[PDB]
Amino acid sequence: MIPTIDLEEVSDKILNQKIREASERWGCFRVINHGVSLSLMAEMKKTVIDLFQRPYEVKVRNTDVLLGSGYRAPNEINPYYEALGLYDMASPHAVNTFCDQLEASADQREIMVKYAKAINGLATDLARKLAESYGLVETDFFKEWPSQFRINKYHFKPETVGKLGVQLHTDSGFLTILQDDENVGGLEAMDNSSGTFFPIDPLPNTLAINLGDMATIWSNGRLCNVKHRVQCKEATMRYSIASFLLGPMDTDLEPPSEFVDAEHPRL
Ligand SMILES: [Mg+2]
């Protein structure tokens, strides 16, 4: 069962411990009182629905920077899935480039810029809190790590009902912040101690956090890179916004020394 964590918990040591234990045992958690404007989130979702209605030949202009960071149309691999996105979402130039490509209106440009900075602010706060929950000295470990923005459109038709939308996976980055569709949902995750699945329902004004492959590597196996998938529950349209804190660009990432020792051998 995925825990919900109150980011306005007054005690840092209780908050950090709750974050750490969620992240170790389940690899994901929900946050409430996250500090992100609710109206900004709703405005982002409307912008997303609108960006996906852009002419096809406009969407194809969303070109890759990292492989897969740009536009993807549904195909025979992922029949129900369409996506747009941008690499280095912490860079205002990257965000504007994306807005240029998709012919974002002025308002839409500003929504994106303010969403990017808010969500990215939250991601770096959660990352610092994870370092704090371990009592690490490297409380700035994430500061040269790029983030990636991806917006998704799921199209489920009546034949899809009762089966999966996209199949089971782990994210490859460090941490992911998901603004899921409050009206649809169906995200599910594997409990590694039983193989049983539990749901991550879209509770309104909340965000879903999950950890990825980079977090397990970084914490030398302690953080759970959770396995998850989205199941189709009804033939409908579903929109989600994902923000990925990735690992290092350049460098090949290994763990802070504190994590590696005789009882926790290196990986
Ligand atoms: Mg995922």
Automatic annotation (TrEMBL):
Source organism superkingdom: Eukaryota
Give the residue spans that cross the bilayer.
Answer: none
A Pfam family for this UniProt protein?
DIOX_N
- For whether the record's keyword set contains Signal, the answer is no
- The UniProt record gives the binding positions of Mg(2+) 2 as D171, H228
**At which positions is Mg(2+) 1 bound?**
H169, D171, H228
**Which GO terms of the cellular component aspect does the record hold?**
cytoplasm; nucleus
Q: Does the keyword Iron apply?
A: yes
Supply the PROSITE patterns for this chain. FE2OG_OXY
What region holds the Fe2OG dioxygenase domain? 144-248
InterPro entries, alphabetically? Answer: DIOX_N, IPNS-like_FE2OG_OXY, IPNS-like_sf, Iron_ascorbate_oxido_reductase, Oxoglu/Fe-dep_dioxygenase_dom
Q: Which Gene Ontology BP terms does the record give?
A: auxin catabolic process; intracellular auxin homeostasis
Q: Which UniProt keywords apply?
A: Dioxygenase, Iron, Metal-binding, Oxidoreductase
- Indicate which residues the UniProt annotation says bind 2-oxoglutarate: N152, Y154, R238, S240
Which molecular-function annotations from GO does this UniProt entry contain?
2-oxoglutarate-dependent dioxygenase activity; indole-3-acetaldehyde oxidase activity; metal ion binding
Its function, per the record, reads: 2-oxoglutarate-dependent dioxygenase essential for auxin catabolism and maintenance of auxin homeostasis in reproductive organs. Catalyzes the irreversible oxidation of indole-3-acetic acid (IAA) to the biologically inactive 2-oxoindole-3-acetic acid (OxIAA).
Which protein family is named in the record? Belongs to the iron/ascorbate-dependent oxidoreductase family.
- The name of this protein is 2-oxoglutarate-dependent dioxygenase DAO
What species does this protein belong to?
Answer: Arabidopsis thaliana
